[PDB]
Structure formats: structure tokens, C-alpha cells
Amino acid sequence: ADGVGNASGNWHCDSQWMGNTVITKTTRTWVLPSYNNHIYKAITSGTSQDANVQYAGYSTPWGYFDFNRFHCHFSPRDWQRLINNHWGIRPKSLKFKIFNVQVKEVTTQDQTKTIANNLTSTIQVFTDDEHQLPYVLGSATEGTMPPFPSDVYALPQYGYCTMHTNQNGARFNDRSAFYCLEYFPSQMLRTGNNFEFTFDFEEVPFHSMFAHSQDLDRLMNPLVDQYLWNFNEVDSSRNAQFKKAVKGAYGTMGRNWLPGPKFLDQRVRAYTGGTDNYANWNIWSNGNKVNLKDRQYLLQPGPVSATYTEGEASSLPAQNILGIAKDPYRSGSTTAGISDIMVTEEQEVAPTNGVGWKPYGRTVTNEQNTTTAPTSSDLDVLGALPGMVWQNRDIYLQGPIWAKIPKTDGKFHPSPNLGGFGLHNPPPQVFIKNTPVPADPPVEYVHQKWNSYITQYSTGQCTVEMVWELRKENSKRWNPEIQFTSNFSNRTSIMFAPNETGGYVEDRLIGTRYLTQNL
Amino acid sequence: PNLGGFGLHNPPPQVFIKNTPVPADPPVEYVHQKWNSYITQYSTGQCTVEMVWELRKENSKRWNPEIQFTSNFSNRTSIMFAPNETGGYVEDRLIGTRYLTQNL
Amino acid sequence: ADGVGNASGNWHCDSQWMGNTVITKTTRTWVLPSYNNHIYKAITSGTSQDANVQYAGYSTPWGYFDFNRFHCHFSPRDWQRLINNHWGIRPKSLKFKIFNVQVKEVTTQDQTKTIANNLTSTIQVFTDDEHQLPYVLGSATEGTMPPFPSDVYALPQYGYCTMHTNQNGARFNDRSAFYCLEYFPSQMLRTGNNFEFTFDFEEVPFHSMFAHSQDLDRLMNPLVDQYLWNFNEVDSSRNAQFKKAVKGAYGTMGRNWLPGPKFLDQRVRAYTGGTDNYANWNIWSNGNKVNLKDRQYLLQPGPVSATYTEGEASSLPAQNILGIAKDPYRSGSTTAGISDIMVTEEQEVAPTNGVGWKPYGRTVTNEQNTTTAPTSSDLDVLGALPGMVWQNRDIYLQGPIWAKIPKTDGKFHPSPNLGGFGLHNPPPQVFIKNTPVPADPPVEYVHQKWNSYITQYSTGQCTVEMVWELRKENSKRWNPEIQFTSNFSNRTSIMFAPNETGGYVEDRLIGTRYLTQNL
Amino acid sequence: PNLGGFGLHNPPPQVFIKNTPVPADPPVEYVHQKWNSYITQYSTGQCTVEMVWELRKENSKRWNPEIQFTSNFSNRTSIMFAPNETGGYVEDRLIGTRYLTQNL
């Protein structure tokens, strides 16, 4: 294909806007180590007796590419052009390349590393097109490409969980599956070789890049009464009374449509002002949980809900938020306060979704009679009922693009709770390993497992090219709308740029919902 | 369906069968009454049911062996899923379909 | 196909001799009962604790046709034309018909049976072409067609043995297979319907219809010496001496060929004269046995051996014989003497096979030296060695035609020990049942197994047409040969004919080996 | 073969591989001697083996279920027929071919 002295690819980063489509291209330099030192390891939770944290699986010698966050594909300026001018976006097609491969050997002598080119060494690359391997993308995990184009990123090690059991610690059982990645055809690359593949997204709904400019309970003409007559009260004579729904009677009016279903969330005050928190409680005791088998885990974030009520504006739904550290590299060994963490604000869905820590509503709790007074209480958690409408969670420049829909007999509204595009056929996983280069063999043959290798690592460039379909904003609104703008003011470095020491700084989460549209 | 199986808007049609009434001896002099007199009839025959089933082939890269349904009944006085000494057909074990595994 | 008042077939019995082939046709009337009363029964050896007699299997409602004896297809006169004029025979093709079917119902009232035609009732018939059912033909069991054409024969009930285990009696295990014969496509016949199928035999060796006129040790010219010099003796001086094999030295001559391999058999005197028997011993204690799993059983009859030495002519090899009762219907509840039993005489194979109760020969038992004298003993039992030649067992007018070769990785000379033609693909089994006719059902539906049936039985005619390939006798022998002839003399009924009460009498076994041929 | 497998008059050919000797520095003045001086070499690479196997399909009228090879290993600290914690590949069970049954 190509020799030692020719480049096998070129650098491509741009965004192209044509018609109803935008094409993003981005190139990175990647680094791949040799993971596990060329073996598979059965990994578990060990002696841990807590069923909730138990797991069983395998770490592999293979690495992988994760481009599943938007800021991989969009500059902040391009994200601005997207969210200010368009009502919708969905992924269409994908092209991925690996080129300019460099395999290097590391030799240590007397605490002295020397790095040299190994020109005859290979890397192996394959994509899993039929989704025959455990799919670890779409879990919102690190190891994604860094947003900034000149940043290098080490490829994460591939591993997976498989079925486990609880007896005196995690154990594999008969349903536990092992996957050898060397049991798949992969092409081998020396420095001259390159790799590419293409992918087409299935048809999915456009993400809704707008906020509603109307509330689900305001849909009627304010100037006219309804012709409906609703039950009002029972008179002292015990006879039922009916009241006409009249203009301004909004509490009593009959409606065709209901807010979407929701869990109840606990409210926390994350910002200055408003109703203050109770002290010394953790979400693990008091939060929403999911029972699965013998295990519990916190239900986070669940379907999206409105973030706050006005006047309570500093409060958050505890578990309904996506937190992201302002410093991507901040260590998770210690907790952080609100000042260190970017938290998503879902207020755009307030017209249809209801606020997270508000109950869905009230429910009648009894059947009344002459001697039984009517009673009612809160409806905290409610499933789907005919007439409900809701919005999905917003997508963020720093958030995940897609998630793989689990393969199941049934689903309800398969929109991922973390946000993004639910896909029956997500983009295939791209696996990469350094081909093992054995060390010096013994002169006299011995029967043993081969543990001796030359230390290798590889580096190169990768281009990701995505095509995005757009819905144009079409609106007769007379007055100006809300736009995302730079209101950062005076700074010691440019926002969404490198700082003095070269660290890339994105301290603000950016959603898509700025333009408005009627219900 | 909660009991399991395939929910169908248009299920296989119901097949109805009756023995045609064969009236008994009528009265020589006509009388106006409902006719209750019949010759006792019954019928027998054979019926074939032919069904076509569409299958999805197992496609898996799993390295290790999987779970299979097998005969582990051991030593018995009659064959399992067979007739016994008096000819009664014996199926004492429920058998589901879920043995092969697949990732989520 | 046909109505109530038309015959669906005609009677065919003849033998046609054309060229190198003979075609036999024969027709019988058959009777089929309803076996088991329309159920399958799991059958075992019961509480029997003797491992040797244990079994497990199933009896079926089905019957079957067994034509696997020669006297089904050959009249005694045709058998005579065969054995006097031909050197060989093998089966070529087969045609079988069932026609003129009559299904009848039996009604018992007050110990009075009435039989009536049931015109709408059916029988079911199928052949197992792919040999997917346990093959019970070729075991030399009763239920074959009777030799005589006007005799009716009830069809035997079909059953089979399947794998069993020994624990506290016979048990089925996981390798035990059940076969539902209603799980096979079968055509259903009313009185107008008929059935047929054709079959082709695979190429097999011609049976050898001749006896050798030479002995395996006489093959040389008596007028000339050999040029071979054989070790003779060791002189008193300890030096070896060599002797020339000279004309008349037959004991000392070198030969190219060896008699066939054999088991040693015990001799019994079955006829008047010769060396008399020891008293009060049974073959079960003293005979040849086979160990199979935890079981023993008598090795009978094993490969064929010569029946006797001259001067011992009244003796038999105990287990190497085929006995057949002169009265086919004699009950097996009591033992019989030689006068009641026809016993095969294999003397034609004496040139190559050696006599059953004679050892194969002598063997040197030691390595001699100056202080060790040579020793030798009998070689009783010997397997196959390069240079052995042998004859198979003869076929008899009253004996089996074929046997199914077991399906195995390996075989040695797959000629059946009972005689006949070993076949990888034997003629298919023909299964027949009376279709169950249910009795009066209950007016009010009840959930129960249906045990109520109308008693049915069926009868009809069946034609078997076989084509046989022949080898013509070609011989330059000047003097007359041995022929099979009628030397019965004066009798109260014709031999191979009915007697005064109509019983068909064949009291003499007839082999095929009369013509002679050189080795 | 007594050890099992397929006896072949013409078995697959033996594949021989050597590292070509690379001689070391020769003497400037020619000497007559056997050459014992070499540069230490070893080689590595990849090899693919592709075999085609002919099969006979199971054809059986047996009504009851048969014996199948299945995973009945139960709970383990590593997957059976997989690597363990230290990466060693573990096959602790011999597996024959004879599970399906057939009449004699």
C-alpha cells in the first residue's frame, strides 16, 4: 500500500454547512499501549460481599476508539451555528480512518528508556459491525476523544462485564460468555498501511432543538369560554353542582392533553438563595432506586423533568441532572461542590414535563358517601396514560451523542435517559491492538506458555467524518428570540480556548434549546 | 399475551364441526310441534395440521460452550417424553425456548 | 382408486427362468389384528435381576411383513432347479404389493361374536426406506410368511429393544430412543385402495452354490517333488537338518494358503454311532460365550466350520449348527431330540474350513535351547492371518435370505453368521396397522384419555416379486456330479406337500452345495 | 489409528522453517576451517491455517430428546474454556464427539 517514507493520510478538521446538512470532520493523534501485556484477564469484584457492587468480566489486550461525545465533532462556534439557527438535528452517516501508523519499541536499560521505531511491527484493527461483542459505548464513560483537535488521547482499554452470581463473592456462571477478540478477522497494519470504514445511521427522530413558547395548560384562546360544564361541588342539600369553564378559569378547564409521566425526585438547593437544605443526608439512603435481581442501584437520571419552579430557581432535582466537572481531569477520589461541577438545566421542558421534585398531581384516595368525606393525596410517580406528551432530555456539546437500545422484546419510548439518540444499530465499535512481538526464544525447545515480549506501543492519526441532517427554523414570530452568545466578559484566557498553560477550557454546558416554537 | 405466545390481530380461524341431525321416524298424521326425535349419530375421521414456522439463526462469536437442552433424566421405568407401560404419554418437564445467550 | 365391488389386484405365484436370472412371484393372504389396542407399551424384563436376560423396549400397535426366508420365494422344485444347475445366486430387485384389503369389525354380545365388513375403515401402510426405525428383520425370528402359498399368515406385532441399564432390573436411560410410528407418513387404505413399492439390492457377492472338489492341502501335482527344503530335525550333534519335500510328503510341504480362522466348538454326538457323549452337561456352562458389557451370551453359531470328520460322522459342533424343527409349530416349552430337529450339515466347507471341534492346529509354546526342550500344544481359537481362505455358511431353503450389516466404523468379512447376504441397505421394513376406529363418545365433553374403540381387524393379499441373479455352472468335469433328488421312497403323503390333514410338510433341510468346483 | 483420528496414506505435508544463518565477521587473512561464527537470529510472524471439513447431517426419527453437550460447570472463578485471572487458558474437560444416537 505504502512505504516507510510516505504519509498514508492528511489532516482534516472542518465543518461544512450545505443546505439541510452539516458535515463535521476532525482528526486526532492517538496513542495505544499494549494492555494486559497481551493476555486476557478474568476480572471480578474480588472478595467484595456487597451484591450491589459485584461484577464479573474480562479485560482484553485490545483498545478502542470512543468519539461518542458531541464536542468531538463540533467546535463551540459550530455548535453555536447549530443551536441558534436550527430546530433539529440527527446523525446520518459516519466515516472513520486510521492512518500514519507508527509502531515503536521501548527498551529499558539501567532505568533508562529508549524509544525506537520498529518498522516491521504491526497493529491490528477491526470494527464489530454485527454487534457481536459486548457494547460498552453509550455508557457515558471516559476515554472519549478530547474536544480540542491538537490534544493527543490515549485509547482506553477494552473490557466488558458478563453474567455473574452472588455466592460468597462474584462468580461466573454457565450464561457467562467469553469473547476472544482474536477470533475476529482484523487487518494488520505496518507504518505504510491505513484503515477506513463507513457507517450509515438508521432513521431516528430529530432531536428537538427548540423550547416551547407555550404551556400545555395555556393552549386555548383566552378570549372565549369553553362550552364545557364541569362538576364543581356538592351543595348542602347533597345535590351535585356543575360550573361552566369560563375565560380565566384555567384551573377548572377541560383539556385534551396531559403532562408526561415522571418519577418523583428529591430537591436539593445547589445554588445561593431559596429554601435551604436539610443537613447530613446522602442520596444513597433517601434516593430513588432500582431493584434488579438481588441488587439495588440509584435511578439516575431517569426520564427528564423540569429543573425548578420559579422562585425556587436555585433548587435541583437530585438525581435528574447530568453533572460534568469543569475540570475534566479533576480526580474522583473526593466530592465536589457546585462550583466545581457543571449541572444541566432542563427548564425548557417545563411546559410539558413538570418539575422533578413536584408530585405529578393529586389523586382521590377514597370512594365517598353520606358518611364518608372525600379524601385525596399526592400522586408522586405515574406511568404512561393516554393523552400524555413530553419532551426528551436535551443534548449538550459535552454530552453523549448516541446509546445502543437494548435488544429486548419490548420498549417504551426508547429515548436514552442520559440524552442523545437511541439506536438499534449504533456505530460499530472500533478495536485496535498492538500485535505482540515475541522476545528471544530459548535455543532448546521447552513446553511452556510464552510470556516474553518486546515492549511496543503505537501512535497515529484518526479522522472521524460525520454527516448530520438538519431541520431549518421556520417561524413567523415577530419579536427577537433567545440566542446563545458570548457573555463571558473579561477573562485571563479566551473561553472555549486554551489557557496560559495550554489546557483547553470549556466551563459552560451548552444545550440546544434556544429557538422557540408553539406547542 | 400475558400467558405467552404470539398476539394476533387476525388469529387462525376457528374450525367448527357438527354432526348433521338425522331425524327419526315422523308421525304418519301431521302434527304441529317442535321436532325432538333424532337418530343418535357420531362421527370420526382424521385431521392434518401443517404449519410453517420462520426461524432466526443463532449467530454468535462466543468462545466458550453454551447451555443446551439435553436429556438428563437418567434411569427410568419408561422413556421420558414417551408412553409408559400402560400407554399413557408422559411429559413431566416443561421446556422453554431460552438456552442460547445473547448480549443486551 | 377403486370401489367396494372391484378387486384391486390378482393372484401371482410363478417362477420365471430367463438367462442368468430367475424371477420369483408369490402371493399370500394375510391377517392383521389390532395390537396393544392402539397404544404403545414400554416393555422390560420386569423384576428379573439376571443381567443376561434384561431388556427394555416398546411394543407398538403396528404389524409388519417378514418374507426373509427362501421358502417364501421358492417352491421345492424351483429350489431344485436352482441348486442343481447353478454356481451362484444373489438378490437383485424386489417388488411388494398389498391389495384386496378387507377391514372387518368384531362385535361380541352374550359370548357371541359377529364379524361384519366395515367399508369406511382404513389400514395404514408405510415402508421405512431410510432405515430410521430399529430393524428387527434378519434375526431369524418367527412371523415370516409360511412357505405354502395357500396358507394364511397372521402378521407379527412390531416391537424393538432399546438401550437399557442393569440397576435393580432393566431401566431405560438417556440413550434409550422411543419411536412413534405415527410420526411417519403412511398411506391410508379403504377396501378399494392398494399399495406397492419397489426396492433394489446393492451389489453383493454371489452365494457359493458349489462344494470344492479339492482340499486346500492337496493343490499340488502329485507327480512332482517340491524344490523346497524344509527344516526337519536337529541331530544328536545339535546341528539342524533339512529335508526335501518330495512327492507324497504332504505333511511336510510348503504351501501358500491357510485354512480360515475359527473358534473351537464342543462336539456332541447327535446320531447313532461313533464316540458317545459325556452325561449330564449343558452348553450354558461349557459352551463358547460372548462378553458384552456386563452380560454373557452363547456364541452361536459363529463363522461356519466343517461339521464332522469321517468316521466321527455322527458328531456335530455343538454351537455351530442351525437347528430347525421338523414341525414348525412344535412348542418351545420343552426340549427336543435329534429326531424332532433338522440340523444343518456343513461338510461342503471341509476343504477350507476345518472341523468345528478340532483345534486349528498346534503351536510351539516355548523358545528352546540346549537345556530347554521344545514344547507345543493345541491352537484352539485363531483370528485372521495373511493367507487364510474360507467358505461362508450355506443358505437353505428354510433359512434366512439376508441380514442387515450393523452400522459401524469397522467390520471383518461382513457375511452373516446365520448365513445369507449381509446388506448395508437391506429391504425396507413394511409396517401395517389397523386405523383406530373410536367408539361412541360421551355427549357431555370430558377431559380424559380416549380408551374406547371398535374392534377391528383386516385381511388381504400381498405379492412379493424378487429378481435373482444367477451364475451358470461351467465345468469340464467328465464324470457325473451330485444332484439333489427325491429319494424319500414310499410315503403316506408326498414330501414337500400337504399331508392328509392339510399340514405342509418339509422335513428335510436343503442346502445349495451339490455341484463341485476346483479350488 | 489407535490414538484416534483419521488414518491417511497421504497426510498433510510437513512444513519446515529455519532461520537462514547469518555469518559473523570473517578473518581478514583466509584460513581453512569449518565456519562456526554466526550472528544470533530469531524470527517471528503470523501463520493462518484454513481447513475445510465435510459433515454428515443428523437425520433421525427419534421422538424423545437426545443427549447434548452443554455447559454444566456452574459457578466458577473464571469462565470455563476461557482465560483465568492470570491469563492462562483453561480447558479442564475432554470433549468427545458422541452425543447423538443412532440405531445399529
Chain B residues touching residue A184 (CB < 8 angstroms): 61
- A172–D76 C-beta distance less than 8 A: yes
- A441–D72 C-beta distance less than 8 A: no
Instruction: Provide the shortest C-alpha distance from residue D50 to chain A (in Å).
Output: 13
- A174–D73 C-beta distance less than 8 A: yes
- A167–D83 C-beta distance less than 8 A: no
Give D40-47 contacts, CB < 8 A, sequence gap 24+: D42/A440, D42/A441, D43/D17, D43/D19, D44/A437, D44/A438, D46/A188
Residues with Cβ within 8 Å of residue C509, at least 6 apart in sequence: C324, C342, C343, C344, C396, C397, C398
The three three-digit cell numbers of residue C23, written as one number:
424371477
CA A427 to chain centre: 15
Q: How does strand A21-32 pair with strand D82-83?
A: unpaired
The residue in chain A having the minimum alpha-carbon distance to the alpha carbon of residue B4 is A409
Chain D residues touching residue B71 (CB < 8 angstroms): 64-68
Instruction: Provide the shortest C-alpha distance from residue D64 to chain C (in Å).
Output: 6
The residue in chain D having the minimum alpha-carbon distance to the alpha carbon of residue B81 is D64
Say how many CA atoms lie within 13 Å of B95 toward its Cβ.
Answer: 11
Instruction: Provide the shortest C-alpha distance from residue A449 to chain D (in Å).
Output: 8
- D71–B69 C-beta distance less than 8 A: no
- B72–C42 C-beta distance less than 8 A: no
The residue in chain B having the minimum alpha-carbon distance to the alpha carbon of residue D81 is B64
Which helix or strand (DSSP H or E) is residue C26 part of? strand C21-32
Interface residues of chain D, partner chain A, Cβ below 8 Å: 42, 44, 46, 70-79, 81-88
**CB nearest D104 (choices: C174, C180, C406):** C406
The residue in chain C having the minimum alpha-carbon distance to the alpha carbon of residue B90 is C42
Instruction: Provide the shortest C-alpha distance from residue B30 to chain C (in Å).
Output: 30
- B78–C42 C-beta distance less than 8 A: yes
Chains C and A touch (3+ CB pairs under 8 A): no
- A175–B101 C-beta distance less than 8 A: yes
> Is the Cα torsion angle C508, C511, C517, C519 positive or negative in sign?
negative
CB atoms within 10 A of CB A123: 27
The three three-digit cell numbers of residue A104, written as one number:
515503536
- Cα–Cα dist B93/D51, whole Å: 41
For chain B, how long is the longest CA-to-CA vector? 88
User: Cα angle at C477 between C471 and C483, to 5 degrees?
Assistant: 65
- CB-CB contact of A354 with A388 (8 Å): no
CA C252 to chain centre: 40
The three three-digit cell numbers of residue B87, written as one number:
400407554
Q: Which DSSP state fits A250?
A: G
Q: Which DSSP state fits C500?
A: T
**CB nearest B73 (choices: C174, C188, C441):** C174
Chain C residues touching residue D101 (CB < 8 angstroms): 163, 175, 177
Give C161-168 contacts, CB < 8 A, sequence gap 24+: C161/C55, C161/C56, C161/C57, C161/C134, C162/B79, C162/C56, C162/C57, C162/C58, C162/C134, C163/C56, C163/D101, C164/C44, C164/C54, C164/C55, C164/C56, C165/B75, C166/C51, C166/C54, C166/C294, C167/B75, C168/C49
Chain D residues touching residue A438 (CB < 8 angstroms): 44
- Cα–Cα dist A183/A177, whole Å: 14
Residues with Cβ within 8 Å of residue C267, at least 6 apart in sequence: C312, C315, C316, C317, C318, C356, C357
- Cα–Cα dist C259/C389, whole Å: 6
- D74–A178 C-beta distance less than 8 A: no
- Cα–Cα dist C83/C470, whole Å: 11
- CB-CB contact of C287 with C376 (8 Å): no
- D78–A174 C-beta distance less than 8 A: no
The closest alpha carbon to C166, from C42, C302, C13, C49, belongs to C49
- B79–C40 C-beta distance less than 8 A: no
In angstroms, how far is the first alpha carbon of chain B from the final one?
23
Between chain C and chain D, the number of residue pairs with CB atoms below 8 A apart is 35
The three three-digit cell numbers of residue C381, written as one number:
481359537
Q: How does strand A402-404 pair with strand A421-423?
A: parallel
Residues with Cβ within 8 Å of residue A155, at least 6 apart in sequence: A30, A31, A32, A63, A64, A65, A143, A432
- Which residue numbers in chain A precede an interruption (C–N > 2.5 Å)? none
3-state secondary structure of A183: helix
- CB-CB contact of A147 with A67 (8 Å): no
- Cα–Cα dist C259/C353, whole Å: 5
- CB-CB contact of A93 with A406 (8 Å): no
The closest alpha carbon to A177, from A163, A159, A158, belongs to A163
- D44–A172 C-beta distance less than 8 A: no
Task: Supply the DSSP string of C411-463, one letter for each residue.
Answer: -SS---TTSSEEESSPPPEEEEEEPP-B-PPPSS---S----B-EEEEEEEEE
- Cα–Cα dist C319/C304, whole Å: 10
Instruction: Provide the shortest C-alpha distance from residue C169 to chain B (in Å).
Output: 9
Residue C259's DSSP bridge partners are: C389
The three three-digit cell numbers of residue A357, written as one number:
421534585
Counting as contact any 3 or more CB pairs under 8 A, the partners of B are A, C, D
The residue in chain C having the minimum alpha-carbon distance to the alpha carbon of residue B42 is C440
- D86–A40 C-beta distance less than 8 A: no
Residues with Cβ within 8 Å of residue A203, at least 6 apart in sequence: none
The three three-digit cell numbers of residue C323, written as one number:
437347528
Instruction: Provide the shortest C-alpha distance from residue B82 to chain A (in Å).
Output: 29
3-state secondary structure of A324: strand
**CB nearest B102 (choices: A176, A178, A407):** A407
This entry's atomic model was obtained through cryo-EM
Helix (DSSP H) and strand (DSSP E) numbers for chain B: 0, 2
- Cα–Cα dist A225/C349, whole Å: 120
The closest alpha carbon to A37, from D81, D46, D82, D87, belongs to D87
- Cα–Cα dist A317/B21, whole Å: 74
- Cα–Cα dist A362/B36, whole Å: 64
Q: Which DSSP state fits B88?
A: -
- D104–C177 C-beta distance less than 8 A: no
Task: Supply the DSSP string of A358-386, one letter for each residue.
Answer: S-SEEEE-S--BTTB---EEEE--B---T
A140, with CB counted inside 10 A (0-12, 13-18, 19+), is: middle
**CB nearest A179 (choices: B61, B67, B102):** B61
- Cα–Cα dist B61/C135, whole Å: 42
Chain B residues touching residue D70 (CB < 8 angstroms): 65-70
3-state secondary structure of C263: coil
- A40–D73 C-beta distance less than 8 A: no
- CB-CB contact of A388 with A259 (8 Å): yes
- B71–D67 C-beta distance less than 8 A: yes
Determine the residue type at C25: K
- CB-CB contact of C46 with C40 (8 Å): no
Task: Supply the DSSP string of A285-318, one letter for each residue.
Answer: HHS-EEEETTEEEE--S-S--B---TT-TTEEES
User: Cα angle at C284 between C357 and C322, to 5 degrees?
Assistant: 55
- Cα–Cα dist C461/C155, whole Å: 12
Task: Supply the DSSP string of A208-236, one letter for each residue.
Answer: E-EEESS-TT--S-TTS--S-EEEEEE-T
The closest alpha carbon to C58, from C47, C37, C38, C43, belongs to C43
Resolution in units of Å: 2.4
Q: Which DSSP state fits C104?
A: E
Chain C residues touching residue D104 (CB < 8 angstroms): 406-408
For chain D, how long is the longest CA-to-CA vector? 88
- A176–D79 C-beta distance less than 8 A: yes
What does the radius of gyration of chain B's CA atoms come to, in whole angstroms?
Answer: 26
- Cα–Cα dist B86/B10, whole Å: 41
The closest alpha carbon to C170, from C52, C55, C42, belongs to C55
The three three-digit cell numbers of residue D8, written as one number:
491417511
Four-point Cα dihedral A102, A108, A111, A116, nearest 10: -30
- CB-CB contact of A475 with A211 (8 Å): no
Q: Which DSSP state fits A191?
A: T
Instruction: Provide the shortest C-alpha distance from residue B79 to chain D (in Å).
Output: 8
C482, with CB counted inside 10 A (0-12, 13-18, 19+), is: exposed
CB atoms within 10 A of CB D21: 11
A142-175 b/e (C-beta count within 10 Å ≥ 16 → b): ebbbebbeeeebebbbbbbebebbeeebbbbbbe
Instruction: Give CA separation, A370 vs A141, A234, A364, in Å.
Output: 60, 11, 16
Four-point Cα dihedral A226, A231, A234, A235, nearest 10: 20
Q: Which DSSP state fits C306?
A: B
- D71–B67 C-beta distance less than 8 A: yes
The closest alpha carbon to A465, from A36, A18, A67, belongs to A67
Of the residues D46, D47, D79, the best mutation for testing chain A's interface (the one with the most A CB atoms within 10 Å of its CB) is: D79
